[PDB]
Write a structure and sequence with these properties.
Chain E: This protein binds to 23S rRNA in the presence of protein L20. Chain E: Part of the 50S ribosomal subunit. Contacts protein L20. Chain E: Keywords: Ribonucleoprotein, Ribosomal protein, RNA-binding, rRNA-binding. This is part of a larger assembly, with chains A (115 residues), B (150 residues), C (55 residues), D (109 residues), E (102 residues) and F (141 residues). Chain A has 6 helices and no strands. The longest helix of chain A is centred in the middle third of the chain and has 41 residues. By secondary structure, chain A is an all-alpha fold. In chain A, α1 runs parallel beside α3 and α4 crosses α6. In chain C, 15% of the residues lie in helices and 7% in strands. Chain C has 1 helix and 2 strands; from the N terminus they run αββ. In chain C, a hairpin with a 6-residue loop joins β1 and β2. The termini of chain C are far apart. Chain E is elongated. The chains are: A mainly alpha (115), B alpha/beta (150), C little secondary structure (55), D alpha+beta (109), E mainly beta (102), F alpha/beta (141). Bound molecules: magnesium ion (119 copies). The site of one magnesium ion has 3 residues of chain C, from loops. The structure holds 2 RNA strands.
RNA sequence: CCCGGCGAGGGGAGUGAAAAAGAACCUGAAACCGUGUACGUACAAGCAGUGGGAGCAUGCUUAGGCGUGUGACUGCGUACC
RNA sequence: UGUAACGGGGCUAAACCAUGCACCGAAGCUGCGGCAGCGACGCUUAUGCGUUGUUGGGUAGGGGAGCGUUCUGUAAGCCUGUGAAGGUGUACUGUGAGGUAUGCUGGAGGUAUCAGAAGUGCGAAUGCUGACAUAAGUAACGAUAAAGCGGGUGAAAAGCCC
């Protein structure tokens, strides 16, 4: 039984060309070029799920270090002051409190000052 | 494939992929790498396995009640009209009417009917006993098939 | 000689940006006949500055 | 009304006719007919005859009135290319392509 | 009004009323939950500290949904070594609406 | 929750003055480059120019430790056949005193559109007088 | 009938269920080449993506939030065989 | 070819040596979900698990369990002009190959389930055939013996006619 394979291949190319939609030049238009870009996009996607977590931590820590030094304490002594006062609050929130409720934040630095 | 064995162009020199013939399967219009040959797909079955299978399937019809055993089963004259009418009383449609004494009257009367098939008790098959929705066996045919299968 | 690898639609476009030719936008009007023509050129009928030039 | 008229299989490449077809775009028919009189190109004559047709096309059949008419959509598409051999030095042959264009003009109001 | 609490191995700055998506809880589709892991409460001043959790603070919430997130494709590809992998993933979540910052 | 990020429209940029008389070049430039970037601010975002406008007046009078007043060279190529132009720290202040703080800050900032954008905010000056009196640029140390 | 060279080619009318079934004639993909709409784009360096992300443009129901297109700026990032 | 022997800015401390608590820091460890492979387990039972510890990077390669395609049997059945296949969008869905439903186009075939057989899946082979790009509106328009003007016909004339 001869299997003509024009139907299945086109669907496979078309599936990937849909994933490459948005890219510049032949990387969107041309399967042979797109398929590389779609894979590399996956390689980078797999990687940057790990880096998202790193960058945001740095981003929070910068905000906390910024907001603490306004009150007169450096980040290193602040987190140690919180850890010595056995405070479980994370960077994500400390950075969020630091931006939004500074009148709130002040008390955390004043608590870190005690320890 | 029809053609010459001559190289379309020489080995080196020309800036093209080295070719040996027009007939090569990577080319168009000649090759088909592993061309098929007229082959015999029929396969061996052991006597005991063929008998065992018939004994297995023919026994399951007794459970499912597809095996409708009967006495004398024969149409009056060689006519389909009578056979089609007489199955309505018997409450059948898709059947394998097995008989010991194969009547030409009954045979000729069941060619044109699609869902009916008339086979001799000697010539029963595995696929047929499975396929058809009921199986009408004659008392003589049961006695023959009993002796045949054993 | 010879390109190392092919230019794009973009480049090809970027080169052609200047190939677009301009219109005249400066048609005259003959004093007598009121026919349109190019400046300092004669008309289709054969006029130039409200005077008959060629039959 | 839109009133399309078009030269199909026009013996000129898209590229060359598209150069003229950019002059006329969203311009008044009377103004557009003048330009192509004094555009020094072959494609000017080729595109003019389509527009000059399209206006009569529009006036007779459908819309009428020559005054309120603008070339809304004018575009050229690459048509069939007819292949020709042109023999070069040292025996090698070169496939010349005589290109054609589908000139379309839409004269709306 | 806002308060902080730990849930799916991680904490959430939440206000009274708003919806919050968090990690899957072993709970029915429209029952309720009480978080006694409240880290912080804010209003006029701050009811912080308590070592891990406050003292008599409980965040009461109601379960909204029990759905799955966006499909995250995972493509591991070693260049040059005849190897690539394909793997989808849909993380389970539980949307909860807060109804009491005590 | 998706974290807060500063919005270029909503950013409220402040003005400052820093008298650079008798200051250490690098330790001035560092503190300048800290503020210019917008680090000190609690709403810091690396992709938005959150930092403040700074005026650095009396740039010519900036101090340097060791032998670097003579020893410190400022190399630059002219983009030419063999044109490598050098100039010592004395000779730099002798001609263009604004360049010293400029160059000392520029290197400490990031490199890119935003890096160049956050340099624009710095306003170095040789003389004590500054023409930015309109913004009420308060004193910073 | 209309335009054009008593042309090519079109536009109407008319046949037909249908004429983007009109003879270059079922279906009509992709490469490739256009026309128009939304955003971005002329101080900015590199496999052109990827995580972050303002604005702007469009939809839905609500009197508050989402999806889609776009992607200023920015961390990482040297194609496949 | 250019500073060019801290990665740079820059520093008499932002160097060195010695101590001291801090903090950052990886896919490492812990936290909370989710999946799978084994070995034990109360002994369930023909396997779900109160479990239960444990792994789970991977080229050559070896061992498992699947997706899909054209064809044959189930099928003179079932779905289909109240719109098949194919084409093209959209929204769900599975751990993957994929699958489901539907808008437009298309205008007549398609095929559940469980079996069977394969011309069964392509990005590369200076692959083979057709189509289309690029260079590019670039070179060139084939002897440097030479054209100029008038009139004619024609929609139009440097080239045709006189
Ligand atoms: Mg076939
Ligand atoms: Mg996009
Ligand atoms: Mg997208
Ligand atoms: Mg290309
Ligand atoms: Mg496309
Ligand atoms: Mg990597
Ligand atoms: Mg980590
Ligand atoms: Mg020979
Ligand atoms: Mg060779
Ligand atoms: Mg070659
Ligand atoms: Mg072949
Ligand atoms: Mg042939
Ligand atoms: Mg053949
Ligand atoms: Mg065999
Ligand atoms: Mg039947
Ligand atoms: Mg017959
Ligand atoms: Mg026996
Ligand atoms: Mg025997
Ligand atoms: Mg190359
Ligand atoms: Mg040009
Ligand atoms: Mg245009
Ligand atoms: Mg020639
Ligand atoms: Mg030649
Ligand atoms: Mg020859
Ligand atoms: Mg659990
Ligand atoms: Mg010199
Ligand atoms: Mg950098
Ligand atoms: Mg700006
Ligand atoms: Mg006429
Ligand atoms: Mg006429
Ligand atoms: Mg004629
Ligand atoms: Mg025709
Ligand atoms: Mg005609
Ligand atoms: Mg018609
Ligand atoms: Mg009429
Ligand atoms: Mg009508
Ligand atoms: Mg009709
Ligand atoms: Mg009709
Ligand atoms: Mg139609
Ligand atoms: Mg129809
Ligand atoms: Mg029609
Ligand atoms: Mg019609
Ligand atoms: Mg239509
Ligand atoms: Mg129509
Ligand atoms: Mg037909
Ligand atoms: Mg067709
Ligand atoms: Mg098409
Ligand atoms: Mg197409
Ligand atoms: Mg536009
Ligand atoms: Mg715009
Ligand atoms: Mg704009
Ligand atoms: Mg400049
Ligand atoms: Mg700009
Ligand atoms: Mg560049
Ligand atoms: Mg880069
Ligand atoms: Mg890019
Ligand atoms: Mg992206
Ligand atoms: Mg993203
Ligand atoms: Mg966002
Ligand atoms: Mg995003
Ligand atoms: Mg908007
Ligand atoms: Mg709206
Ligand atoms: Mg960047
Ligand atoms: Mg990098
Ligand atoms: Mg030197
Ligand atoms: Mg050095
Ligand atoms: Mg260093
Ligand atoms: Mg140190
Ligand atoms: Mg030490
Ligand atoms: Mg681990
Ligand atoms: Mg776990
Ligand atoms: Mg043990
Ligand atoms: Mg366990
Ligand atoms: Mg493995
Ligand atoms: Mg199976
Ligand atoms: Mg299937
Ligand atoms: Mg199939
Ligand atoms: Mg079949
Ligand atoms: Mg049959
Ligand atoms: Mg039939
Ligand atoms: Mg039927
Ligand atoms: Mg019937
Ligand atoms: Mg048959
Ligand atoms: Mg179906
Ligand atoms: Mg329908
Ligand atoms: Mg339909
Ligand atoms: Mg379909
Ligand atoms: Mg399935
Ligand atoms: Mg299926
Ligand atoms: Mg259906
Ligand atoms: Mg359908
Ligand atoms: Mg048929
Ligand atoms: Mg079929
Ligand atoms: Mg099918
Ligand atoms: Mg079947
Ligand atoms: Mg069915
Ligand atoms: Mg099914
Ligand atoms: Mg079934
Ligand atoms: Mg094959
Ligand atoms: Mg291919
Ligand atoms: Mg391969
Ligand atoms: Mg063909
Ligand atoms: Mg040209
Ligand atoms: Mg060139
Ligand atoms: Mg050119
Ligand atoms: Mg040239
Ligand atoms: Mg030339
Ligand atoms: Mg010649
Ligand atoms: Mg020559
Ligand atoms: Mg000669
Ligand atoms: Mg001579
Ligand atoms: Mg005449
Ligand atoms: Mg004649
Ligand atoms: Mg005449
Ligand atoms: Mg004539
Ligand atoms: Mg005449
Ligand atoms: Mg005339
Ligand atoms: Mg003449
Ligand atoms: Mg001549």
């Amino acid at each position: 039984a001869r299997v003509k394979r024009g139907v299945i291949a086109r669907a496979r190319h078309k599936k990937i060309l849909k994933q490459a939609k948005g890219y510049y030049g032949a990387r969107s238009r041309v399967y042979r070029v797109a398929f590389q870009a779609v894979i590399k996009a996956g390689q980078y996607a797999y990687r940057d799920r790990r880096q998202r977590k790193r960058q945001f931590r740095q981003l929070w820590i910068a905000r906390i270090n910024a907001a603490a030094r306004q009150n007169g304490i450096s980040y290193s002594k602040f987190i140690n002051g919180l850890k010595k006062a056995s405070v479980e609050i994370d960077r994500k929130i400390l950075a969020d409190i630091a931006v939004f409720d500074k009148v709130a934040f002040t008390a955390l630095v004043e608590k870190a000052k005690a320890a | 494939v029809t053609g010459s064995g001559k190289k379309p162009w020489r080995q080196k020199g020309t800036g093209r992929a080295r070719s040996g013939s027009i007939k090569s399967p990577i080319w168009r219009s000649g090759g088909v790498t592993f061309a098929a040959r007229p082959q015999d797909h029929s396969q061996k079955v052991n006597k005991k396995m063929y008998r065992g299978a018939l004994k297995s399937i023919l026994s399951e019809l007794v459970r499912q009640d597809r095996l409708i055993v009967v006495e004398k089963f024969s149409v009056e004259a060689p006519k389909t009209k009578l056979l089609a009418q007489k199955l309505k009383d018997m409450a059948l449609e898709d059947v394998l009417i097995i008989t010991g004494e194969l009547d030409e009257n009954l045979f000729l009367a069941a060619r044109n009917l699609h869902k009916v098939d008339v086979r001799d008790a000697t010539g029963i098959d595995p696929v047929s006993l499975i396929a058809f929705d009921k199986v009408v066996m004659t008392a003589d045919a049961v006695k023959q098939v009993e002796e045949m299968l054993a | 000689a010879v390109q190392q690898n092919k230019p794009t639609r973009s480049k090809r476009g970027m080169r052609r940006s200047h190939d677009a030719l301009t219109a005249v936008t400066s048609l005259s009007v003959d004093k007598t006949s009121g026919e349109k023509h190019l400046r300092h050129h004669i008309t289709a009928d054969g006029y130039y500055r409200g005077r008959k030039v060629i039959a | 009304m839109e009133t399309i008229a078009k030269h199909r299989h026009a013996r000129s490449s898209a590229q060359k006719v598209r150069l003229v077809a950019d002059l006329i775009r969203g311009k008044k028919v009377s103004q557009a007919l003048d330009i192509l009189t004094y555009t020094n190109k072959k494609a000017a004559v080729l595109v003019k005859k389509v527009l000059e047709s399209a206006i009569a096309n529009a006036e007779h059949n459908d819309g009428a009135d020559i005054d309120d008419l603008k070339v809304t959509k004018i575009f050229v598409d690459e048509g069939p290319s007819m292949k020709r051999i042109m023999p070069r030095a040292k025996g090698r042959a070169d496939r010349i392509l005589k290109r054609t264009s589908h000139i379309t003009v839409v004269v709306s109001d | 009004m806002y308060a902080v609490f730990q849930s799916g191995g991680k904490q959430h700055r939440v206000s009274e009323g708003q919806t919050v998506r968090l990690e899957k809880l072993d709970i029915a589709t429209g029952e309720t939950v009480e978080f006694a892991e409240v880290l912080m409460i804010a209003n006029g001043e701050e009811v912080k500290i308590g070592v891990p959790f406050v003292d008599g603070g409980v965040i009461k919430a109601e379960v909204v949904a029990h759905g799955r997130g966006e499909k995250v494709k995972i493509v591991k590809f070693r260049r040059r070594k005849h190897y690539r992998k394909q793997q989808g993933h849909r993380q389970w979540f539980t949307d909860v609406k807060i109804t009491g910052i005590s | 929750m998706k974290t807060f990020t500063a919005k270029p429209e909503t950013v409220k940029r402040d003005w400052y003055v820093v008298d650079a008389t008798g200051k250490t070049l690098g330790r001035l430039a560092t503190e300048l480059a800290r503020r210019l970037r917008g680090k000190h601010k609690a709403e810091y975002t690396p992709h938005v120019d959150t930092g403040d406008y700074i005026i650095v007046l009396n740039a010519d009078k900036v101090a340097v430790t060791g032998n670097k007043r003579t020893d410190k060279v400022y190399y630059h190529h002219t983009g030419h056949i063999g044109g490598i132009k050098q100039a010592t720290f004395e000779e730099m202040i002798a001609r263009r005193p604004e360049r010293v703080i400029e160059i000392a800050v520029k290197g400490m900032l990031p490199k890119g559109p935003l890096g160049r954008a956050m340099f624009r905010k710095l306003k170095v000056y040789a003389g004590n007088e500054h023409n930015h009196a309109a913004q009420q640029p308060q004193v910073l140390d």
